[PDB]
Design a protein around this ligand. Structure first.
Ligand SMILES: *[C@@H]1O[C@H](CO)[C@@H](O[C@@H]2O[C@H](CO)[C@@H](O)[C@H](O)[C@H]2NC(C)=O)[C@H](O)[C@H]1NC(C)=O
Ligand SMILES: *[C@@H]1O[C@H](CO)[C@@H](O[C@@H]2O[C@H](CO)[C@@H](O)[C@H](O)[C@H]2NC(C)=O)[C@H](O)[C@H]1NC(C)=O
Ligand SMILES: *[C@@H]1O[C@H](CO)[C@@H](O[C@@H]2O[C@H](CO)[C@@H](O)[C@H](O)[C@H]2NC(C)=O)[C@H](O)[C@H]1NC(C)=O
Ligand SMILES: *[C@@H]1O[C@H](CO)[C@@H](O[C@@H]2O[C@H](CO)[C@@H](O)[C@H](O)[C@H]2NC(C)=O)[C@H](O)[C@H]1NC(C)=O
Ligand SMILES: *[C@@H]1O[C@H](CO)[C@@H](O[C@@H]2O[C@H](CO)[C@@H](O)[C@H](O)[C@H]2NC(C)=O)[C@H](O)[C@H]1NC(C)=O
Ligand SMILES: *[C@@H]1O[C@H](CO)[C@@H](O)[C@H](O)[C@H]1NC(C)=O
Ligand SMILES: *[C@@H]1O[C@H](CO)[C@@H](O)[C@H](O)[C@H]1NC(C)=O
Ligand SMILES: *[C@@H]1O[C@H](CO)[C@@H](O)[C@H](O)[C@H]1NC(C)=O
Ligand SMILES: *[C@@H]1O[C@H](CO)[C@@H](O)[C@H](O)[C@H]1NC(C)=O
Ligand SMILES: *[C@@H]1O[C@H](CO)[C@@H](O)[C@H](O)[C@H]1NC(C)=O
Ligand SMILES: *[C@@H]1O[C@H](CO)[C@@H](O)[C@H](O)[C@H]1NC(C)=O
Ligand SMILES: *[C@@H]1O[C@H](CO)[C@@H](O)[C@H](O)[C@H]1NC(C)=O
Ligand SMILES: *[C@@H]1O[C@H](CO)[C@@H](O)[C@H](O)[C@H]1NC(C)=O
Ligand SMILES: *[C@@H]1O[C@H](CO)[C@@H](O)[C@H](O)[C@H]1NC(C)=O
Ligand SMILES: *[C@@H]1O[C@H](CO)[C@@H](O)[C@H](O)[C@H]1NC(C)=O
Lengths: 229, 234, 116, 318
């Protein structure tokens, strides 16, 4: 299916562009960081206009009007308010920085365990079975394009945990036993690709009196016809 | 509508949304409509007055402010006759019904037209704001927004509770009242107030003032606090 | 907390007069200037009225149909602007209901795939 | 089967900074305005916390696109899940075990509490969907469509995933089902008798209760004023003197809120980290199978089942 896969991949990327080019909210996680920091600074600057109990928020207006014995009192009121304002700002920046650091740590983890490797961790690198990922830069952040394998179409098959041959219980080495209503096949779990059940597909352990739901079939031995002819 | 907004101070601002509390005409409030056809009563001044008039022939030429307006107290008189604006604050003897035909502490001498004014008294200071603009409307006040600049501040020290207008007889006018509302004023790039939000007009306006913006993004915002008020004291 | 009336010696409890935060629920102003108001943690007494556990919601129409959550109110209730359009309130959907056809001998195996 | 308990959320408190500091006082409020945005930026910070609390809940539980439900016939290969599946006879369709969890974990000063967006019933529906998915379709519902598979076969895959050949399961299916069923009964006996079992969630409740009680008690402090009661200052002093006494209370009460909010932001970060962990486990524990050691309990992980709890999630790791 290489042509199909390449075409689906190429189409999926085109869809990414259409989404990013039209949905502003797509980058809300990065835009929000910018907005929170802008708001923090605007708040800090606006606090300079506050009196905090002083006759004026403007320091030069206090100094140009009062002698030191009185000016110092009015100034101390502004210093306390403005010093308190910075402490509030810095505390918020430290807490916010911790949030960003945690995100950066996550991003670094994904880069290593998503871009440089292949993730067996579920929904770590997008919904579906992770194949590969590609990083893209963004303002103050990283964007990952996660390429995943998603089952698309399915059929209802009858199944069994094991098959009886000569009284021996045969289990799949890989895959499951399936039935289309008339014939039993063995196939890989994540993609329907029925194969004849043979001794090279299954293994034997125990017998038919133990396994619950074991069914009768035949298991083909590839050696027989070579010795038979 | 959105009339009755004036520049709250004498500071230049531009490209900014500024929140201020002052005596403004509440948005979409009722203003009494008077007529001058084929109407110059004494009105309450309350805590400040918004005044507006529409002209085609300059019929409205003046104002009287005071408590009794009968030579018993000082009363501010403003008259504009041809090209000369006259302001006096004498204990004037006014007529039983003052009009103009076609112990003083101060004296000064200098529809198609809408002339808006704001008259307020703070600590004895009579503050006058105004704006003149061309119009093309006879029936009523034009809808739209225009901010009024200050022109005059008279330290008269007069207790004003009532006022009356002066008409030229051979021009409708409106009287509104100001309230201590908070407004968000939008200054454009030239420092002109081009829009405004009355923060107590409705929940949406409250939201706009809270967020300091004339645009509100989709969502739920906490803007105020509901509090039941007492009815009587015990 | 309480006082004894100085003229008649009985005890009166003092409960502060009803109050609460007021929130405005709105579609962006680029869509509509219609809003709904939520009076937080109050009854629809002291304040098209819907009583929720989040408070008294006024201006939003109560709709029986669930939808995906848009502007959250709280306590399972979300609001949105829909049809002619107005603000509606509803219990949010948690997703479509989909039973799995489970049995002791039936397996569903994908026959095709998509790369997303 | 082991039980791992994680906090997901914390009470969505909200404080009216003006009412807290200057309750019903015009004279105090006008003085408070001289501090600019100091009041409203605290209202903002607390709102931010309240909002992420719904985000935390949503990220942990709403990982399934559809609400799955088990069949009326519980033919799960001998494995009894009746104590983790919803009970139809209850006013809220929670499982027996969830009820146990909920039964173990337990003003007018501008302090209020907002409800969560997702009610306990909605959380129960999500854990039900995740559980029904896990039982009837294994991990396929996580990746894409929920693909039915016999439970015994699902377990066979779970065994191959830990390096044990599938024939072991089938040959010992009765033993395995019996051990599983017994292990669940043990979970109930532990949760029903050991109060400390839910200490991680009870502690969150206690820390938040303590933070609010501390904040309220601070209103009784004078902070250098003649009285902690604002009305007693106003009823006794003329403005030129009352304002001085009030400023002392405003500084103290404003400082008290700032202390409270800072502690809530730091605590919220701890809860967020826990919620992120819980969300990670849900995806890499309930929706899948973990190869990560001791990530989903001690031993070789097979499968896990979520259960809701007050302000948190409980995982039963098999
Ligand atoms: C199950 O699969 C088998 C094998 O493909 C189907 O059997 C074949 O059917 C075709 C006709 O479509 C015949 O030409 C082949 O000779 C048959 N092969 C054998 C080995 O008998 C069978 O019909 C399928 N069953 C169902 C219910 O679809
Ligand atoms: C699978 O095939 C075996 C034979 O290979 C069946 O065994 C029979 O079981 C019945 C019932 O006890 C006995 O009466 C017969 O004598 C047994 N036959 C032989 C040859 O021993 C078994 O029942 C079959 N199972 C299914 C589900 O069809
Ligand atoms: C301005 O003048 C008015 C009267 O024109 C004064 O109002 C009176 O106030 C007294 C109390 O001091 C009341 O008993 C009267 O009944 C009021 N009169 C009216 C008509 O309401 C007002 O107090 C004066 N303003 C100042 C600052 O002195
Ligand atoms: C798997 O699904 C793909 C589509 O996602 C199938 O490819 C399409 O086949 C139809 C004809 O039936 C064409 O009209 C489309 O243009 C094809 N799309 C693409 C992207 O190639 C594919 O045939 C299916 N495979 C199987 C085995 O069923
Ligand atoms: C799953 O286990 C429960 C016990 O937790 C079983 O329910 C009990 O059934 C017996 C009868 O055999 C009653 O006497 C008990 O009172 C029931 N207890 C409860 C709590 O319901 C249930 O039948 C088992 N289910 C399966 C399929 O084995
Ligand atoms: C499998 O059988 C169920 C029976 O309820 C049906 O609803 C479902 O669509 C079937 N699946 C397929 C892929 O045909
Ligand atoms: C599967 O379920 C059917 C009932 O629908 C029952 O008769 C049959 O014996 C069961 N088989 C197994 C292996 O449990
Ligand atoms: C304005 O006057 C109209 C009557 O013409 C009345 O219905 C309306 O309620 C009044 N509004 C206000 C704010 O006074
Ligand atoms: C305006 O009134 C003044 C008296 O107040 C008078 O002296 C003057 O002549 C009048 N008009 C003009 C145009 O001068
Ligand atoms: C001017 O004011 C004085 C009070 O100082 C008063 O006695 C006098 O009568 C007033 N003049 C007139 C003309 O009323
Ligand atoms: C400022 O005034 C100039 C005229 O000098 C005008 O061209 C320009 O558009 C004005 N700016 C705004 C924002 O109205
Ligand atoms: C108040 O008046 C009543 C009579 O109506 C009297 O009985 C009572 O003792 C008085 N209370 C006080 C405190 O004097
Ligand atoms: C928002 O309104 C402006 C008009 O000021 C319009 O040009 C723009 O397309 C609108 N955008 C949306 C998303 O409705
Ligand atoms: C509102 O008051 C009524 C009684 O009139 C009561 O039945 C109802 O439960 C109350 N609702 C809330 C949300 O308090
Ligand atoms: C929901 O439907 C019921 C009828 O089953 C009806 O009585 C109720 O008023 C409806 N509620 C709304 C909000 O439409």
């Amino acid at each position: 299916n290489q042509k199909l896969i390449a075409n689906q991949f190429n189409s999926a990327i085109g869809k990414i562009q259409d989404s990013l080019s039209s949905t502003a909210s797509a980058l809300g996680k990065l835009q929000d960081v910018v907005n929170q920091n802008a708001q923090a600074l605007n708040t800090l600057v606006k606090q300079l206009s506050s009196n905090f109990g002083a006759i004026s928020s403007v320091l030069n207006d206090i100094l140009s009007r009062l002698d030191p014995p009185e000016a110092e009192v009015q100034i101390d009121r502004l210093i306390t308010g403005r010093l308190q304002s910075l402490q509030t700002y810095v505390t918020q920046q430290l807490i916010r920085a911790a949030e960003i650091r945690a995100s950066a740590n996550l991003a670094a983890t994904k880069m290593s365990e998503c871009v440089l490797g292949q993730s067996k961790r579920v929904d770590f690198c997008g919904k579906g079975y992770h194949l590969m990922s590609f990083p893209q830069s963004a303002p103050h952040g990283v964007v990952f394009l996660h390429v995943t394998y998603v089952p698309a179409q399915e059929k209802n098959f009858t199944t069994a945990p094991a098959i009886c041959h000569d009284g021996k219980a045969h289990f799949p080495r890989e895959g499951v036993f399936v039935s289309n209503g008339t014939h039993w096949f063995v196939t890989q779990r994540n993609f329907y690709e029925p194969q004849i059940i043979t001794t090279d597909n299954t293994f034997v352990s125990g017998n038919c009196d133990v396994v619950i739901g074991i069914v009768n079939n035949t298991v083909y031995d590839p050696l027989q016809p070579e010795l038979d002819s | 509508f959105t009339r009755g907004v004036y520049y709250p101070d004498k500071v230049f601002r531009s490209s900014v949304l500024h929140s201020t509390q002052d005596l403004f005409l509440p948005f979409f409030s009722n203003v009494t409509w008077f007529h001058a056809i084929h109407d110059n009563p004494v009105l309450p001044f309350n805590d400040g007055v918004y005044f507006a008039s529409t002209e085609k022939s300059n019929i409205i030429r003046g104002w009287i402010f005071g408590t009794t307006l009968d030579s018993k107290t000082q009363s501010l008189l403003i008259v504009n006759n041809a090209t000369n604006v006259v302001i006096k604050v004498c204990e004037f003897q006014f007529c039983n019904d003052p009009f103009l035909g076609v112990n003083c502490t101060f004296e000064y001498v200098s529809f198609k037209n809408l002339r808006e004014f704001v008259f307020k008294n703070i600590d004895g200071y009579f503050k006058i704001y105004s704006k003149h603009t061309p119009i093309n409307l006879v029936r009523d006040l034009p809808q739209g927004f225009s901010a009024l600049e200050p022109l005059v501040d008279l330290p008269i020290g007069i207790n004003i509770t009532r006022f009356q207008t002066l008409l030229a007889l051979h021009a409708a006018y409106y009287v509104g009242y100001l309230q201590p509302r908070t407004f968000l004023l939008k200054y454009n790039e030239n420092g002109t107030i081009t829009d405004a939000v009355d923060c107590a007009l409705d929940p949406l306006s409250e939201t706009k003032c809270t967020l300091k913006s004339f645009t509100v993004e989709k969502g739920i915002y906490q803007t105020s606090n509901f509090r039941v008020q007492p009815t009587e004291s015990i | 907390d309480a006082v004894r009336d100085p003229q008649t010696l009985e005890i009166l409890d003092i409960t502060p007069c009803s109050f609460g935060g007021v929130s405005v629920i709105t579609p962006g102003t680029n869509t509509s200037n219609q809003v709904a108001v939520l009076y937080q943690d109050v009854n629809c007494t002291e304040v098209n009225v819907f009583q929720t556990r989040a408070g008294c919601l006024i201006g939003a129409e109560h709709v029986n149909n669930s939808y995906e959550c848009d502007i959250p109110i709280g306590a399972g209730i979300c609001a949105s602007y829909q049809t002619s359009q107005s603000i509606i309130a509803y219990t949010m959907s948690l997703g479509a209901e989909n039973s799995v056809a489970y049995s002791n001998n039936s397996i569903a195996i994908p026959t095709n795939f998509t790369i997303s | 089967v082991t039980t791992e308990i994680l906090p997901v959320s914390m009470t969505k408190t909200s404080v009216d900074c003006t009412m807290y500091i200057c309750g019903d006082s015009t004279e105090c409020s006008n003085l408070l305005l001289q501090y600019g945005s100091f009041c409203t930026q605290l209202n903002r910070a607390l709102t931010g916390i309240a909002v992420e609390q719904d985000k935390n809940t949503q990220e942990v539980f709403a990982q399934v696109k559809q609400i799955y439900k088990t069949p009326p016939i519980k033919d799960f290969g001998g494995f009894n899940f009746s104590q983790i599946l919803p009970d139809p006879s209850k006013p809220s369709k929670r499982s027996f075990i969830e009820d146990l969890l909920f039964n173990k974990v337990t003003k007018f000063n501008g302090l209020t509490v907002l409800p969560p967006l997702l009610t306990d019933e909605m959380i129960a529906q999500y854990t039900s969907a995740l559980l029904a998915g896990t039982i009837t379709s294994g991990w396929t519902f996580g990746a894409g469509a929920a693909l039915q598979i016999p439970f015994a076969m699902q377990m066979a895959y779970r065994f191959n995933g830990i390096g044990v050949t599938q024939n072991v399961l089938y040959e010992n299916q009765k033993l395995i089902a019996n051990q599983f069923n017994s292990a669940i009964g043990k979970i109930q006996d532990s949760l029903s008798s050991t109060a400390s079992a839910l200490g991680k969630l009870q502690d969150v409740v206690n820390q938040n209760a303590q933070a609010l009680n501390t904040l309220v008690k601070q209103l009784s402090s004078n902070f250098g004023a003649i009285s902690s009661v604002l009305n007693d200052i106003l009823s006794r002093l003329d403005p030129p003197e009352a304002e001085v006494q009030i400023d002392r209370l405003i500084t103290g009460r404003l400082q008290s809120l700032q202390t409270y909010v800072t502690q809530q932001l730091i605590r919220a970060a701890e809860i967020r980290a826990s919620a992120n962990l819980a969300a990670t486990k849900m995806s890499e524990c309930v929706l899948g199978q973990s190869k990560r050691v001791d990530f989903c309990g001690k031993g070789y992980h097979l499968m896990s089942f979520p259960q809701s709890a007050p302000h948190g999630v409980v995982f039963l790791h098999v």
